[PDB]
From TrEMBL:
The protein's name: Monomine
GO biological process entries: symbiont-mediated perturbation of host defenses
Keyword Signal: yes
Cysteine-cysteine disulfides: C3-C119, C33-C141, C92-C120
Signal in keyword set: yes
Keywords: Signal
InterPro entries: Calycin, Tick_his-bd
GO MF: amine binding
Length: 146
């Protein structure tokens, strides 16, 4: 019931393999197959390399890298501070960034998007209020870089 979230670092790192697709967001105009993928995890410093992007041309994911870090209860990539609203550290995250509510899903969770952690879906549904949602992930998205 309490749906106790993991820490921002535990969210960022996740299972420590694979990556995350943006599943739902309040933000319109988002490019299909938006994703992030962490690597080079430094548990002591709570830093990682992020590779991120979305669907580009030629049915290929774009890739750009950045240092990811933690500030308070936010995952920091460039100037973006994504505040962790709920994460299980395993399969899904709900974050707030630039006013938007975002539900991210691990690559392992993409085949059953109707059976996600109830804590994630409840948090997303509560926090979006009356704002329309947008679905960004589709099954035909390419696999993540690696």
């Amino acid at each position: 019931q309490q749906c106790d979230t993991v820490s921002a670092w535990q969210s960022l790192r996740g299972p420590g393999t694979g990556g995350y697709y943006l599943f739902k967001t309040t933000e319109g105009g988002k490019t299909d197959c938006t994703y992030v993928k962490g690597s080079n995890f430094n548990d002591a410093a709570q830093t990682a390399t992020y590779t991120y992007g979305n669907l580009g041309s030629g049915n290929q994911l774009t890739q750009q890298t950045a240092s990811a870090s933690i500030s308070g209860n936010a995952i920091v990539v460039g100037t973006d501070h994504s505040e962790v609203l709920y994460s299980d550290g395993s399969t899904c995250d709900v974050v707030r960034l630039n006013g938007q509510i975002e539900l991210w899903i691990h690559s392992s969770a993409t085949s059953n998007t109707g059976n996600l952690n109830s804590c994630c879906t409840d948090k997303f549904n509560q926090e979006k209020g009356s704002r329309p949602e947008h679905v960004v992930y589709r099954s035909t998205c390419p696999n993540l870089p690696a």
